[PDB]
């Protein structure tokens, strides 16, 4: 909700921390998977400085497509949200599980 709010001026700035703190928090935890995901949605709709902020977590993403669990619900959460994570590098890392997820 706060993420939902500002867009940017607070975004460019304080945010990077919490991204450490998603890293800090959860690898991700099963529930917080669903959360951070849907949170990164809130994130994902704002920056374009995701791009630098990317891959502390774009790492953990592939905890998940490899991990995985629960009906693929987690996946299709992240899976979709990635279509919000857009875009333009790192398909390097993106496609391989995805295609393996056909």
């Amino acid at each position: 909700s706060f993420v939902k709010s500002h867009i940017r001026p607070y975004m460019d700035e304080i945010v990077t921390l919490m991204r450490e703190f998603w890293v800090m928090n959860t690898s991700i935890q099963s529930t917080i998977i669903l959360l951070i995901e849907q949170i990164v949605v809130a994130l994902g709709g704002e920056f374009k400085l995701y791009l630098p902020q990317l891959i502390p977590h774009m790492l953990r993403v592939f905890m998940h497509d490899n991990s995985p669990g629960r009906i693929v619900s987690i996946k299709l959460l992240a899976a979709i949200q990635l279509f919000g994570a857009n875009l333009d590098d790192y398909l390097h890392l993106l496609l391989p599980p995805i295609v393996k997820l056909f």
């Binding site: 460019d12 994902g44 709709g45 374009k48 400085l49 630098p52 857009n86």
Partner: protein
């Protein structure tokens, strides 16, 4: 003209006010425009009226001369300022070109045109009438300024940013800024063509010539960094489109890293691969490394010709394509740059072989009246036979021959001099 045409300018500080050095930036444009030229009317902050005036001044400013005309804009806090009328009542060889800088309205503005045009197209008819053509509106964080504004100036300047920005600059390192002037003489000459590849890549057939137009149209493609924002700022144009793609785009990337070394220190280089490495296997396909391709290349060759270069090996590789003709000979004339450049040098000896080989086979293409090029060949082409050599000139001399038998622009007296030299070697060759 010199500089080309009439141009418009605007800036949004807010509404009806000057500003420190806001004055100053305007000229920089006209400068930059002169760096690309022309009669440019600067403005600042105006309420709509003050603007409306000088439009009519340029609407008065006589562009039947100009080769085009421009309408610039910029960011004010969303100045609505004649969505339609002033625009649309000033509406569709001094060809108008419109320019937009918006958060949203850009397309809307463009959308508006057609819509307003839809009126100002159709609704004119029953009055039996504004015809949209040659009137175009081009569309538009930490380090920007105004991108799509800077974009066209600044063409390479902006480029250096998307260099430093970001992940690649790990490899080429490192950054600083500026300096590096006369080695940069090439980067333009390169980035000049580096786009035009994609152009000939994508053109089909809407295209150049007319200069400053394409000069934009080129610099347009610099918008593919667009990368900034998930609204990667997506300029819209309807006179396209790939951006992205266009391997030359991926190519200029390490064509930069070719420059990122020498800039570190001391320059020194100098050199760099690009034009060369592009030049080489242009023969490959030229020989038999292409199935129709579509030449894959020739666009590159054009600007490549202009320099001392490599000029021969190009002009060499030129005739190669002239050998692969007739089929691609048109494509040559599609590019036509021979007509540009081959005629552009009437200034050959060693080149006379290619000047034959390229130019003859060019001249062979049957045809375009040489016009003053006929006096130039009356100089150049005539003086070729001086050595009486080679058979490399055998029919090559006869290139210009039928021109006089084609139509009469004398072709008599300037031919009379040749009339002496022609029949002279005729029996001396004695070869059918």
């Amino acid at each position: 003209t010199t500089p080309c045409a009439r141009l418009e300018c605007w800036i949004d500080p807010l509404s009806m006010g000057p500003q420190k050095a806001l004055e100053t930036i305007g000229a920089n444009l006209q400068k930059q425009y002169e760096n690309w030229q022309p009669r440019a009317r600067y403005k600042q902050s105006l309420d709509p009226t003050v603007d409306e005036v000088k439009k009519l001044c340029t609407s008065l400013r006589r562009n039947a001369k100009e080769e085009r005309v421009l309408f610039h804009y910029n960011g004010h806090g969303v100045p609505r300022p004649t969505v339609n009328g002033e625009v649309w009542v000033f509406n569709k060889m001094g060809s108008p070109s419109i320019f937009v800088y918006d958060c949203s309205n850009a397309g809307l503005i463009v959308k508006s045109f057609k819509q307003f045009a839809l009126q100002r197209e159709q609704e004119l008819e029953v009055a039996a009438p504004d015809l949209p053509a040659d009137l175009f509106t081009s569309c538009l964080d930490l380090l920007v300024a105004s991108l799509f504004r800077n974009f066209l100036l600044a063409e390479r300047i902006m480029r250096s940013y998307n260099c430093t920005p970001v992940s690649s600059p790990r490899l080429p390192p490192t950054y600083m800024h500026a300096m590096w002037q006369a080695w940069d003489l090439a980067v333009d000459i390169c980035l000049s063509q580096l786009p035009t590849i994609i152009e000939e890549g994508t053109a089909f057939r809407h295209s150049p010539f007319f200069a400053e137009q394409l000069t934009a149209f080129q610099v347009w493609l610099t918008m593919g960094v667009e990368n900034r924002n998930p609204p990667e700022q997506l300029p819209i144009v309807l006179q396209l489109s790939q951006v992205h793609r266009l391997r030359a785009l991926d190519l200029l990337g390490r064509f930069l890293d070719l420059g990122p070394w020498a800039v570190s220190l001391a320059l020194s280089v100098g050199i760099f691969p690009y034009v060369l490495k592009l030049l080489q296997s242009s023969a490959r396909e030229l020989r038999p490394l292409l199935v129709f391709i579509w030449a894959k290349i020739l666009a590159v060759d054009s600007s490549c010709q202009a320099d001392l270069v490599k000029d021969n090996g190009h002009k060499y590789f030129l005739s190669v394509l002239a050998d692969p003709y007739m089929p691609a000979e048109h494509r040559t004339m599609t590019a036509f740059i021979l007509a540009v450049i081959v005629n552009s040098y009437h200034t050959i000896w060693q080149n006379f072989d290619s000047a034959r080989w390229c130019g003859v086979r060019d001249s062979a293409h049957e045809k375009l009246y040489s016009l003053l090029s006929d006096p130039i060949p009356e100089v150049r082409c005539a003086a070729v036979f001086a050595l009486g050599t080679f058979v490399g000139n055998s029919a090559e001399r006869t290139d210009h021959s039928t021109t006089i038998d084609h139509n009469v622009a004398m072709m008599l007296a300037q031919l009379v001099s040749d009339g002496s030299p022609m029949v002279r070697k005729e029996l001396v060759v004695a070869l059918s």
